[PDB]
Amino acid sequence: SSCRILTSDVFQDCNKLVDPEPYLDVCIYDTCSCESIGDCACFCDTIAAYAHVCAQHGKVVTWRTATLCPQSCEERNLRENGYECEWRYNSCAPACQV
Amino acid sequence: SLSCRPPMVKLVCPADNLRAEGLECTKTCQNYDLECMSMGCVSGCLCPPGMVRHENRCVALERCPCFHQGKEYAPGETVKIGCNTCVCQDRKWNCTDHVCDATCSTIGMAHYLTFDGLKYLFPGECQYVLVQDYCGSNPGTFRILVGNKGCSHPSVKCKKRVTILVEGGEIELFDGEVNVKRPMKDETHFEVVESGRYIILLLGKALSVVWDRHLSISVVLKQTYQEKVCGLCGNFDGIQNNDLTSSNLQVEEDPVDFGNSWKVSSQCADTRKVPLDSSPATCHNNIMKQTMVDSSCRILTSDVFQDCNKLVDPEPYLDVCIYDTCSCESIGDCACFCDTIAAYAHVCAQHGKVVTWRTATLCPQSCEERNLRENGYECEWRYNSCAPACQVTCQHPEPLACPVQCVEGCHAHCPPGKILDELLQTCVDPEDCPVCEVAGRRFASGKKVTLNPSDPEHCQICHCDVVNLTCEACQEPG
Amino acid sequence: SGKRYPPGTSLSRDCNTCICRNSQWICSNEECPGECLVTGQSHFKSFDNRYFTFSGICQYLLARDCQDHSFSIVIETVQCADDRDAVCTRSVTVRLPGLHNSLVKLKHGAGVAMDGQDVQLPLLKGDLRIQHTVTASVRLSYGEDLQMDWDGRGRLLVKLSPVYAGKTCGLCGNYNGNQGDDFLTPSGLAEPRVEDFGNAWKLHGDCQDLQKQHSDPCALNPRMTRFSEEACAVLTSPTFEACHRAVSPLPYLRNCRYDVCSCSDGRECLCGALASYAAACAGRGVRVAWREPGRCELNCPKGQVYLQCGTPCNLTCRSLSYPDEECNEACLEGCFCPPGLYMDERGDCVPKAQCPCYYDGEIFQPEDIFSDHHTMCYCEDGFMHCTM
Amino acid sequence: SSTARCSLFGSDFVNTFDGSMYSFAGYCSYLLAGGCQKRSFSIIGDFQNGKRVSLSVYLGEFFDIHLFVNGTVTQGDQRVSMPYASKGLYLETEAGYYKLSGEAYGFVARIDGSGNFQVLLSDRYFNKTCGLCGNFNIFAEDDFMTQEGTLTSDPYDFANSWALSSGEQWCERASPPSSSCNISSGEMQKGLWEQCQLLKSTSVFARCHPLVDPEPFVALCEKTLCECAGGLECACPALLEYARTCAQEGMVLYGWTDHSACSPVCPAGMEYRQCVSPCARTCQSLHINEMCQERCVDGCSCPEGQLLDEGLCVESTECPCVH
Numbered sequence A: 001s002s003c004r005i006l007t008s009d010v011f012q013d014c015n016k017l018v019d020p021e022p023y024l025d026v027c028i029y030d031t032c033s034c035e036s037i038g039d040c041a042c043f044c045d046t047i048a049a050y051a052h053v054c055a056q057h058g059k060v061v062t063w064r065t066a067t068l069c070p071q072s073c074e075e076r077n078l079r080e081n082g083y084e085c086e087w088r089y090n091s092c093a094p095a096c097q098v
Numbered sequence B: 001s002l003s004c005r006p007p008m009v010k011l012v013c014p015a016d017n018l019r020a021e022g023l024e025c026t027k028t029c030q031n032y033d034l035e036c037m038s039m040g041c042v043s044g045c046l047c048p049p050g051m052v053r054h055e056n057r058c059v060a061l062e063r064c065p066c067f068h069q070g071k072e073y074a075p076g077e078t079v080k081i082g083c084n085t086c087v088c089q090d091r092k093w094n095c096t097d098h099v100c101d102a103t104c105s106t107i108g109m110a111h112y113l114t115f116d117g118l119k120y121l122f123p124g125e126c127q128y129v130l131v132q133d134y135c136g137s138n139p140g141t142f143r144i145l146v147g148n149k150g151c152s153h154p155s156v157k158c159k160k161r162v163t164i165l166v167e168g169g170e171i172e173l174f175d176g177e178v179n180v181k182r183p184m185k186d187e188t189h190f191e192v193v194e195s196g197r198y199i200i201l202l203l204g205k206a207l208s209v210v211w212d213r214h215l216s217i218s219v220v221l222k223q224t225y226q227e228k229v230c231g232l233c234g235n236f237d238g239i240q241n242n243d244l245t246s247s248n249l250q251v252e253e254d255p256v257d258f259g260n261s262w263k264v265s266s267q268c269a270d271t272r273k274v275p276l277d278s279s280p281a282t283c284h285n286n287i288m289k290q291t292m293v294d295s296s297c298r299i300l301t302s303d304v305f306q307d308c309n310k311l312v313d314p315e316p317y318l319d320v321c322i323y324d325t326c327s328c329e330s331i332g333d334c335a336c337f338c339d340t341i342a343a344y345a346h347v348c349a350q351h352g353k354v355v356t357w358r359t360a361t362l363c364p365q366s367c368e369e370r371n372l373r374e375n376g377y378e379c380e381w382r383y384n385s386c387a388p389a390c391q392v393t394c395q396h397p398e399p400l401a402c403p404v405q406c407v408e409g410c411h412a413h414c415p416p417g418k419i420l421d422e423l424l425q426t427c428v429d430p431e432d433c434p435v436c437e438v439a440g441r442r443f444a445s446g447k448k449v450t451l452n453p454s455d456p457e458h459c460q461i462c463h464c465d466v467v468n469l470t471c472e473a474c475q476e477p478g
Numbered sequence C: 001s002g003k004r005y006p007p008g009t010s011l012s013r014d015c016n017t018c019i020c021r022n023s024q025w026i027c028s029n030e031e032c033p034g035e036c037l038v039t040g041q042s043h044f045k046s047f048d049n050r051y052f053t054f055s056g057i058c059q060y061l062l063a064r065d066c067q068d069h070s071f072s073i074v075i076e077t078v079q080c081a082d083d084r085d086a087v088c089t090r091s092v093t094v095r096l097p098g099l100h101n102s103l104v105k106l107k108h109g110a111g112v113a114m115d116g117q118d119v120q121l122p123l124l125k126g127d128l129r130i131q132h133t134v135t136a137s138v139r140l141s142y143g144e145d146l147q148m149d150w151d152g153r154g155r156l157l158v159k160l161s162p163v164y165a166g167k168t169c170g171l172c173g174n175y176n177g178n179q180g181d182d183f184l185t186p187s188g189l190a191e192p193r194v195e196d197f198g199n200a201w202k203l204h205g206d207c208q209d210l211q212k213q214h215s216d217p218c219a220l221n222p223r224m225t226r227f228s229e230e231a232c233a234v235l236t237s238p239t240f241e242a243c244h245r246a247v248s249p250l251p252y253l254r255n256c257r258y259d260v261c262s263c264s265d266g267r268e269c270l271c272g273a274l275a276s277y278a279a280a281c282a283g284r285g286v287r288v289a290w291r292e293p294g295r296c297e298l299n300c301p302k303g304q305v306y307l308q309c310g311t312p313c314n315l316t317c318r319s320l321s322y323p324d325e326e327c328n329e330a331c332l333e334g335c336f337c338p339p340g341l342y343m344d345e346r347g348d349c350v351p352k353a354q355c356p357c358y359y360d361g362e363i364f365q366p367e368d369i370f371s372d373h374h375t376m377c378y379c380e381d382g383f384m385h386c387t388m
Numbered sequence D: 001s002s003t004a005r006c007s008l009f010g011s012d013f014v015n016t017f018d019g020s021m022y023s024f025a026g027y028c029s030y031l032l033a034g035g036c037q038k039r040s041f042s043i044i045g046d047f048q049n050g051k052r053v054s055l056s057v058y059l060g061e062f063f064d065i066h067l068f069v070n071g072t073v074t075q076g077d078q079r080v081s082m083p084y085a086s087k088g089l090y091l092e093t094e095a096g097y098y099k100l101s102g103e104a105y106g107f108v109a110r111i112d113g114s115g116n117f118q119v120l121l122s123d124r125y126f127n128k129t130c131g132l133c134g135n136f137n138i139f140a141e142d143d144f145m146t147q148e149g150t151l152t153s154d155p156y157d158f159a160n161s162w163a164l165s166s167g168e169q170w171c172e173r174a175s176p177p178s179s180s181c182n183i184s185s186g187e188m189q190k191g192l193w194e195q196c197q198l199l200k201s202t203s204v205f206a207r208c209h210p211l212v213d214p215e216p217f218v219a220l221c222e223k224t225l226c227e228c229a230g231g232l233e234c235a236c237p238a239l240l241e242y243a244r245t246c247a248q249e250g251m252v253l254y255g256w257t258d259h260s261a262c263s264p265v266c267p268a269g270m271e272y273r274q275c276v277s278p279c280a281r282t283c284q285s286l287h288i289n290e291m292c293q294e295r296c297v298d299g300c301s302c303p304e305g306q307l308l309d310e311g312l313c314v315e316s317t318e319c320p321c322v323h
């Protein structure tokens, strides 16, 4: 059931382009074998691998919430005493900037 | 040979007295009140009768320190254990007698920490009396209950339901929010402080409830009761080994027969006596996994908690960690692990030891979604390790009785001259609060209460909805 | 305990009685005696039924009367194997200020030594009696408010009657019914760290105080990890089914795995820990038959036979010499021999024909005619028939 | 340096990390090395009766590879094949001799054909470990600190402190063997004093003296040249050790086995080279280079051609295929 996030309301755009059946078989295989205890990374990394392929075909996606694979970004805005708050989690931003 | 130092004088065993308590019974500050064995003395050099040894120094006066946690304390110095101060004027600690405010808990899915302090295991699936007051020969004011579904084996299942019955009311909570099925009469004492990750919830002068929105139930009671309650949390008497007095008025030894006495529905299923073992179901005959879980639960004994481990024993909160996340099949949400450590960090916070144990690769807890409804990203909400739960807002501008010093969670922080309201998510200037001041005096922001029931002739009522400087007319009884 | 009883019944705990009336047991609150217990390596039990562990090496104070000074007990711990997590009891020292201000000492055997002098048992002084129990364990009994048990291989016990309610202090606690205050150092303040509690009762300053009490010594000897699981898995097996609802087994299981991995020989460390549980199940009413040729059946000599529940009153040959004395003893477990045979001093047990007499302490043979001028006495079959 | 070395060479002898030899004819399992404050692993050595059998690595609480002279590497109780790579412990063969690498955990064990345990161990455990191969410090005299912590003068009761029993067998204190040499002295000390002496005389060994001292090595041999009857080969075990102990220090020696009349045992097709690469170019191999910059290791290997294929040297023309 939890690997059916790959077939959910938020991915319906990409499921028509990229078949999810390959990326689902990996999900069931990994997180069965994986004994996830503190870090739920053996699950959150198989979906991100599908979202990135969906992004290359122009379908940006925001699937990540606070109760599922949170990915905070607040520690980079810490070394300065004054909290400027410029670092943020952006769903799919350009990698090649200046 | 060595002529011993001036401050002390050598001794010699007399041939007559068997009681040659000399070098062997060297009285230091530890073993003065303690009584010592001795066969005969030795050819040592012992301090005079009026003084003792103290770490390679014969300290003269009987002023030597008063140890606690293996640390020095000069006479006159104080220590704060709980809500009491305690001074060693002399050589024994001299403490006050102000009994403090106790606290149940539900650490994980199936465990319970009584008031006096007794962790025990009780996996149930029916509805159970967590604590109440109608116990034996009393009026019966409040009847906090608790109810679990699919929670005999901890997992991503086991959502809790909580029905609290005070002042003829029925306010209950599950699935994140709190719901009022029947409002209670004296609304003045009611209060709800949705601050951070918790739902603090007052109900009177001597009652409070806390709820982490997921599983934990930490009811806080004051000095008022002192053996007036009973339930799964026990009687709140100080005696720590009578917290298993079942409903049928006897002490039991097996807690799985205890909580079965406190179920409401006397015809649902009573839980099964599990065969005892150090390994739960998933960790049963999976000794590989049983070490990866043990190691990860040693965060409770890590460099960041060393301050608290000296105050609060982690051995109770570790047994819960190994038990829950074995049984829990954590797949997408690692909450059956991250919630057992937060329960230890919060107890460490109540004793004044704030902790920052939470990183990006371990239980991240972002707070960026609240800073989203506005197109302009103002960035006032932040994860703060342990911030005060009882602050001032447009909805609760006055200071409230604050059972919890600080709490984890996302907290809105912005420069001064602005006060937080929850409906409009950001902080806003004070004047924008729907605040009420009718006929001069300071009070809350227009509570929906009918003041002054007592005297008919002095029935001078003045409500305030949001802003109105109004007063209503009383309907005469005649 | 998960079973139904009709109304009007009266089941009895070891402490007191309770009667069913209107689905509610009525119960008395009269005090009942406590038991501090040392056993295994370093495993203590307070009077208030607290369990803990403190592996220190010094002379520690176990118990003491602390408003007056009727007695004081002093344990003496030593390391006891190659490992560092193995600290067994070697001796215990008792002190009675009521009689000579003497000093009894229970040695690493079944031996006792008053004021340096070894002693043959029994030792009827005025108040204190010291005698064997199964002829393999000593039992001190001062007055009617104090008992003890063998400190040979380290299984000390005490029995304190309710006249000492709340007026004692030591590692074993206050004896006040409260289990939480027992970590109270002599400076009058409860400590949360056991490593602070025990090292505050040491009597000598030169002794090294410990910094950490370890919980898993099977890490230093990973060979015994497997064996320590299946070995004391019998403790939760249904062999002990009858006393899970009498005393919690989960600590007596926790204390096994610390003993079998730590000590030099895990054979008897196993079979002295399983008996720590049966000895508590039996102190509440439940006897268990847990002995096998594999699970450590003791070898009673050829004269004796194994026996589960028997009477240690008609066993010793001294009984026939002093028959009028009362034997208000329980139904104990040990090595006896059949009722036609009575126990002789030399390990063999014999019929009552050649069972000697113990007149005035003197051991007379089965036929010894014997007389001063005025009295006339003889030994017939165990008893000394005197006349005048 | 950044490494260490223990060796249990010949019969009953030991060589700690710091130039301290002795003899120990144990009876059961004993701890070679491993931490002392907290053990992530523990290397263990089983002795049947004086003579050794197995090397064992218990990786905390959950895993146990079991190599031995028996070579039939088992695990737990189930006999497995070889090679084997579970849990970050690659159980390979190098130069015809068996290896157990734990680079994640910081150790490299191995055994030769005769049976000579060896333990290369990292500098991360400097001052930390304690066991039958002593602590990894600079000094060589203090490295008998018992399981309690006690500098003992005896090299024997020490090793009997570090015993570790199981349920299958509980073990007692072994006794030092009563030497039969004390009566059968005869000529055996006159004519055979030379094979020990040639560690000092011959030029091929006459250059590690500024790195090590042969005085213990000649001392430990003279007590074991007396029980074996009719053989000069009884000196080469204590001599073979001296070769490696100088190699590990950063100064290797060459061709010393040409005239010594003792070569270490190896299976057919191969004999003892010195400083052969571990990345033996075998038959079913991929022709890739300049990844194997590892240090150079002693052990027996094939001739110049004659590539390896399943534990035997075979000519390069007859390289098979696989499917």
Ligand SMILES: *[C@@H]1O[C@H](CO)[C@@H](O)[C@H](O)[C@H]1NC(C)=O
Binding pocket: B089, B094
């Ligand atoms: C505690 O201190 C108070 C105030 O100095 C003193 O009155 C009292 O006697 C002390 N009590 C004890 C038990 O030392």
Ligand SMILES: *[C@@H]1O[C@H](CO)[C@@H](O)[C@H](O)[C@H]1NC(C)=O
Binding pocket: B382, B383, B384, B385, B386, B387, B388, B413
């Ligand atoms: C944490 O919260 C407290 C109380 O509101 C506040 O005083 C403090 O500045 C906050 N610290 C951080 C790091 O946000």
Ligand SMILES: *[C@@H]1O[C@H](CO)[C@@H](O)[C@H](O)[C@H]1NC(C)=O
Binding pocket: D048, D053, D054, D068, D070, D071, D072, D073, D074, D079
């Ligand atoms: C030697 O190896 C054999 C075959 O693997 C095994 O059956 C036996 O138990 C081993 N014996 C010892 C002493 O290790």
Ligand SMILES: *[C@@H]1O[C@H](CO)[C@@H](O)[C@H](O)[C@H]1NC(C)=O
Binding pocket: D126, D127, D137
């Ligand atoms: C070894 O560790 C001990 C204890 O921490 C320390 O006292 C000593 O200086 C260390 N020695 C070396 C050589 O690092």
Ligand SMILES: [Ca+2]
Binding pocket: none
């Ligand atoms: Ca484009």
Ligand SMILES: [Ca+2]
Binding pocket: B116, B234, B235, B236, B237, B238, B239, B240, B241, B242, B243
């Ligand atoms: Ca209580």
Ligand SMILES: [Ca+2]
Binding pocket: none
């Ligand atoms: Ca303060």
Ligand SMILES: [Ca+2]
Binding pocket: C048, C173, C174, C175, C176, C177, C178, C179, C180, C181, C182
């Ligand atoms: Ca107490």
Ligand SMILES: [Ca+2]
Binding pocket: D016, D017, D018, D134, D135, D136, D137, D138, D139, D140, D141, D142, D143
């Ligand atoms: Ca050394």
